[PDB]
Amino acid sequence: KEVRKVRIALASPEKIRSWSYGEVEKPETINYRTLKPERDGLFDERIFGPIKDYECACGKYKRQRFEGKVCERCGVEVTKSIVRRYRMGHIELATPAAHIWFVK
Amino acid sequence: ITIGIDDAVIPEEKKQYLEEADRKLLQIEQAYEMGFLTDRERYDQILQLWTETTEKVTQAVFKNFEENYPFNPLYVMAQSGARGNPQQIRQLCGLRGLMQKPSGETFEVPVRSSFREGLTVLEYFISSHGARKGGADTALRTADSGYLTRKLVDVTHE
Amino acid sequence: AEPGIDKLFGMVDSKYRLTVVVAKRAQQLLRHGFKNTVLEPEERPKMQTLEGLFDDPNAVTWAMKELLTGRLVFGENLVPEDRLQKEMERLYPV
Amino acid sequence: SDPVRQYL
Amino acid sequence: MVQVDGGRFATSDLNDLYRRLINRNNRLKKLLAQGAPEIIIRNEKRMLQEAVDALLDNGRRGAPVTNPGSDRPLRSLTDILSGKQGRFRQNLLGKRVDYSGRSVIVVGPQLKLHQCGLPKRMALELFKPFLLKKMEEKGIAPNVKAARRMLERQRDIKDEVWDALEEVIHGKVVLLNRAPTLHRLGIQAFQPVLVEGQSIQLHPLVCEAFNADFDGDQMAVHVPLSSFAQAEARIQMLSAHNLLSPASGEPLAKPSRDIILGL
Amino acid sequence: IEIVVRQMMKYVEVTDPGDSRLLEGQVLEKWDVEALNERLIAEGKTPVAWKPLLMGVTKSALSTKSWLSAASFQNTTHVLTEAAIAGKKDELIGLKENVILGRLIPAGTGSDFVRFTQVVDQKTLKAIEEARKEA
Amino acid sequence: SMARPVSIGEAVGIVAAQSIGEPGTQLTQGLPRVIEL
Amino acid sequence: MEIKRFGRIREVIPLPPLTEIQVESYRRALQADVPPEKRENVGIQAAFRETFPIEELVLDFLEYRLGEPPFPQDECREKDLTYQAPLYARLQLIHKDTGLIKEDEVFLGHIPLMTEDGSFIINGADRVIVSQIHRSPGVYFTPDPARPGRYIASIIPLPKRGPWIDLEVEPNGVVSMKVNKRKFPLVLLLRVLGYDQETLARELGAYGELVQGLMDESVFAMRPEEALIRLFTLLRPGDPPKRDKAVAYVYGLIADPRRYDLGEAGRYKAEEKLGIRLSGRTLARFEDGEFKDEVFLPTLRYLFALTAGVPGHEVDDIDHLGNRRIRTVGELMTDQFRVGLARLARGVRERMLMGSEDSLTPAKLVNSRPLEAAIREFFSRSQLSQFKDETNPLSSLRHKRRISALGPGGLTRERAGFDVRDVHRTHYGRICPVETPEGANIGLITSLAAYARVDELGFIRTPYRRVVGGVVTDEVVYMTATEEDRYTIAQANTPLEGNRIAAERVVARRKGEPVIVSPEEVEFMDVSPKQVFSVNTNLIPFLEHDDANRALMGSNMQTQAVPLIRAQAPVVMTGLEERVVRDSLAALYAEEDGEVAKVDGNRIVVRYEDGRLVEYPLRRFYRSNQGTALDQRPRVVVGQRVRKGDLLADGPASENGFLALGQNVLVAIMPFDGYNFEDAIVISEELLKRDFYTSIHIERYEIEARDTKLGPERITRDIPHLSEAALRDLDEEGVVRIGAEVKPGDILVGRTSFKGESEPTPEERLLRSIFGEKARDVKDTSLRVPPGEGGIVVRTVRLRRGDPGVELKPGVREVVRVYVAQKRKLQVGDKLANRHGNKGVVAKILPVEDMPHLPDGTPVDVILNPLGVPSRMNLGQILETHLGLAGYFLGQRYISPIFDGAKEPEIKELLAQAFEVYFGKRKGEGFGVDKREVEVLRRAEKLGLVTPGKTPEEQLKELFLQGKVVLYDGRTGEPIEGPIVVGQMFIMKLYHMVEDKMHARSTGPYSLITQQPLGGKAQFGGQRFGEMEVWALEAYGAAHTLQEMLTLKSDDIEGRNAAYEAIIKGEDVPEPSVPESFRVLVKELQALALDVQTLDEKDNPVDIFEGLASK
Amino acid sequence: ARTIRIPVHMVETINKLSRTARQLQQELGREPTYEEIAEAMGPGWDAKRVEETLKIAQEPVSLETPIGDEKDSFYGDFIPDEHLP
RNA sequence: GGGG
DNA sequence: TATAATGGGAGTCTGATGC
DNA sequence: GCATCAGAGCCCTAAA
Ligand SMILES: [Mg+2]
Ligand SMILES: [Zn+2]
After folding, report:
1. Gap from H235 CA to K16 C1', in Å?
2. Minimum CA–C1' distance nucleotide for H557
3. Per the domain annotation, does B102 fall within a domain?
4. Number of compact structural domains in chain C
5. CB-closest option in C2, C49, C58 to E235
């Protein structure tokens, strides 16, 4: 189908969660020795997708015969690495915070 | 078609017009120290005298060209619209004219020289104030103009 | 200036409609390898190589020239779009 | 208005 | 988070804004489970608000969050969207483009109004994909991949490749642009005439519309790729078809300077 | 200059809503209130009383129906907060909207007037016609 | 530019802004009066 | 050849050392050559004295010393090191609680040293610190714009050394004080100073309504202590107004000679303006337990008398160059030093309150990191520390004398308005009115005038000769602008007989205002016309004939002149071209009298009278910052007798010691077939043939081999899948051999890198299996020549880890640098300019036979279009050509000083003498007047050029005196129908060359987030099609061209990939898909918690992520 | 404190290495080499290990770091994308 | 910071 | 994991619009 | 009235 319109609207917390592939539980980025992303951190492949096309993190499933499988050992989906541009995460606030645009 | 230094032709009328301007100028000075005219009035009359003397020398430059040198390069370029305009040619063969102070008010003393005769360091410096003000004005304007255009585009684009 | 550009603007109600007709026609020619052209061997646009004369490869040049002949029909809602495509691929293979 | 000062 | 050339890491400011947030959220959860007094939980909560605030719009309220030992405000989500450098006015309403080049412009009196001088070396890059196909069709190379390998080293370029390029550009136009593009004639279409040499040759008559001199101006070249784009350029944008000002209706391409002088 | 001035006068302010949902003092495009008022005069209800409004190009540009247009101009957060609250839908009428999406602008070869124009040669037009002129 | 009826589809608003803006550079009220209007 | 010098002005003093603004400033700051006890309290010394002693234990400063540089300058440039000296300080620790004294000399790091010519070497690259103009500290009074009859007194300290103060007098009648944007009634502060109502009434009172308006009873109802506490609450809402805490705040802001510094110049201006004497640089003191006023009451006293109209009170012009001062290299560096020192002091106090209050020496107590960082930060990242302009010697000379009003402690572009950019009347003789940038920076960046020097306080002074009675002495007085305004100063050209003023009326200035005056009234006189203009402007002959706007371009462009291998001095000079070369230090001179012992390409050995044999090595083909070649050539021969200061070697762009920025060419001023159009320039192929406008350029290439987690990068000759033809010019180790021609695509340094887990794909595995060849462990990462570059390899530097003397940044095994040279012949697109602002790009190179030529066969070099002259109003170039014509036949060069120059009669005399040589030769050789010469003369006599009724020789001579000659068109042989201006002009080849600027891209690198092409030629970038370019395409209605720009030619990834595949297959390009940067926008709005939905006509969502982002 | 998190004990070694160099530079009047630090650190330490440790201690740099002082051009703008074909 |  | 230690340090000019 | 906010032209180079 063809795009005729662009709507913009407020996002409920449910929908923000409807977007998210995982909760970012840790400030970690990548491991200082291996340089691979840290589990549950900002770059985690279990959340945002694989770094390499159709290849999971630990490398049990490395090619496209499996597309959509989630590796039992490392937990990463086998798909295009492009998804690290698309998939959103989320942070679950303990107490609510106001969105400054609607305040200031 | 070429340009040599002799192609900027000082009209004979210039020396005369300068003599006319100085006798006129002395009479206006007498009305100041004798108390006939004010400080405001004296300055205003001087500017008026020198503007008209400037115009006079311009017509003389172009009349001398048309009658006695109609194929002169400066004249030809200006008249055809190839390059040059009367005020620029007037600065080459005439006088440079009145210059502006750093504020905006004009000096009473004009630049009597032409680029062919050459200026005096003091004339050159006096003239510099206006050049710089013109350059700063233009620089700050292109931004105002540029911004204006973007507003117009944004309001009419559909 | 494009040859007979004034006459091409004559043929249309809006200059942009000329461009659409030209562009679409040039695409028709490229996809089908020119064998649907309405030009005749002496009307074919030519291109001078080091070898010598060959067919002008530029299809947009072809299309404007074709248009000048009068042999092209332009308008809206003439033929269902898909049916045209099949009849042309039947008449002029790929 | 100043978070340190408020806490102090 | 990318490794640059030297093995060094370069990272976006958003990562630091998130990290502040995550730390404060996690500490808040811990302070709650351990039953901290209200003064402490309150301090943590207001700090959490500020961390969210910096992430979304940094500097909007309160001191801008900075990386340590730099005064540079971190670039938050609001800064990314908005401003001259923002997403809209930088990557959306305008973009950098492929099949484009730039060089110094030089006058080309011998040109017809619809032509420009285009350096052959510029033309080889701008039309490179077209040139590869043509190099296969005649035969300068066995296939497309080998042809590209030949253009990489400048001494591996033989003279038949230049003839191939002449064939490629036949009947096609290129777009010339000179900044600032004040009105639509800041861009015009020209049929390129390949020239030896590093300079773009511009027709004298179009200098006025572009406000071009030869005191060192440069112009940018663009290649309309599709049959549709090429048609638009040749009909609507061609220099020869725009002779009158869209503003006043008066002639734009008209005699000036030497032309006026001689006549 | 007239094209621009026309856009400056694009908007009106409600003096009396009559039998409508509008509020006194609400600002809206002159076009939208005329369309509404002809639905009221055709429904037999008191029309909206409005007054002409003049705004400079900046204010006028920021007030446009298209939020992609307005937010890419200036005041990006403000434009975007009001649009998101309202649930605004951009119909992609103007140029900037389509430029942002990388769409084909609704001008020149993109205008709906010339966009769908077909070309066919007589040698193909007649060929297609004969097979279908029968059962 | 063509000295003839305008073609449907011409983006006239854009041409209007370019036609008014382009001279802005060479304006010595002056450009301030134009912006005021 | 002969050098004929014009002008009658006798200049009593030579130009000062031109780099002294740099050299003297830094020497004064470091005082390295002064024995410590004799150092004055200034620069580094003053900083230490200000920071110490450090109170709680007391750490006291004894003295500092500067070591010798670890490496010489040449070595620093080679190794990417800073040229610097070790700084040590002797410190004594005292225990106030005990008696303990420990003394040690602690190492504070290095301080960068200035070279002899006034520049720096910071990380191997040469840098210049640009002087900064700003408002002098002091006390100023300006009229209040709001109330046309009231005034504001402003107390301004040195930058970052205190707050700005405003004393506005409010509508209610009370005198208000503004500090840090907060206002209160000034009476309260007066009470804190210990003032009583009597003192203010008795001191001031004379002003009926003003003095009584300051008196407020509630404030007096409290002793000086209560008023101090009361004021503090008015300033710090929330800090408990503890009496010691309040004192601390007010003392540090006002009375502390550490947190508040009026200048030394501030002290003088304050003492002078208010007629008081300051005990220090602070607004108040803490003495005998309370505060005692210094400044505030005198400033209040001056304000009220001015508001009234008391004689002796004036407003201050804030743009006057007496009230505007220069912060030179020394001062700028010292400010950063003081900052770094204060940070170290924080560290001292924090370490003196921890780890045992006893077991600490000064060496453990001091961490020098804050000091080293402040200095390294200033030199590397400051805005006043700039990459040296060393295109030619004049470039750097000019760079060092530039004056900026921007930078850390000055304006911004987003924040500077007309008053500052203006040419002030006081700029006369101090700041050049010509040399400033075109564009946004006009008036903010300027240049020191030729005779100007910055005094110790920082005010620019200019020389004048004293005139007593009517006799002009030779005693010269350097004046500030404030002091100059007192006298009546006659112009430098006023007629003199001997030492006497010979005119009854002289042209003079009083406060910048031009005035006609009798010799009895003449107090001083200008030293020279040169003193009004910069060094670049002073290099323009016949400047009095050039419109200033073009002279500006003339000045700036000499900075851009490229050193030419045949470089020559202009045939018409101004007489400054000798001094510029000498002060630049590019040229080499003899120290004492002597005899030349040896002369080489590489060196010159001189045997002096002393008996010592001194060897001067020559800098040969060294690469400057801009890649122009700095190269010195020997000008003497073995055994030549030299005196002190005689030339030994020529530097770049110098010829026998005179500045050579270009070449002298034979020019014809005339249209030529439109190749001359709109400033384009036509040149003769003869110029390339004889190597005119040829210049050497060197480009530097660098590559690192580093340790990776995948294994070491290796610089090797073994590179996978490459033929021996490709590797031919590489040595055993993989480096290109010295003396090879390298062209784009060629390997410079071979390098291999270990393949990622990208460990060749199964598609590649099977392919590799077919050819019997296993896929290699390493991939080819070799350094290659970029498009459009290349030349001859003249040098290679290799630096490994584990070689004596070298250690690289962590992880880097080895670094190879390759220096590649190119001889650049002039070509089409290169830019030429003369000194009058005529500039143009070379549009056509004609073969010599097409060039216009004189009857005697001499072809012209350059054809310049006359249409460039009349609107531009630069006629000096015309006079330059005429005098240049005379010199071509007379074999001479001239020195015509600016404003005291060769005039028309004098040029005519020279021109007549030339005609005899141009013509008399012919009449004697047995040739008469030409037929075509008669035809032109016919047309010329119709033009009123020649007198009708004279012989052809007489008429040609009449034309030659107008600088016009008969010119033959080399194409036809027929004459040009009129006489044409021909002569010798000085023209430079500027640094803007097509070879550097030509760029093109099909596809290339893309950006990480936006996926749009990168920018710039060096990244192989795409052109920016910006908002305004999109508008143009919209106005054309080019919808598909525009859409291509927005998608297939940028960030539509599927589209750009698919379009390329179609073109190489001969298919038409596909319809585009969504631009990736729109997807970025969508995801960025989601990160802001906004739901952005693409919808169809049925209002159902359309997924532009094609299922990838939904669970 | 670090964008790349480092084990607490490793941060202690790095901080130790810093202090040591500061001592070494204060007595020597110049930057110590890797070998001089390796000596000062005692057994187990060679120059190779001092270098590897400093490599590990390097903090990333902002993609938004400005090149020049104008607001235009960022360091991230000069970084090609090596991932996408 | 230079160029148009 | 144990002397005692209890409140921080630091720096232009425009026009439009909501208290 | 007065404060608070968000505006303030385009393309290009080189240096970091
Ligand atoms: Mg130009
Ligand atoms: Zn796995």
Report:
1. 31
2. J2
3. yes
4. 1
5. C2
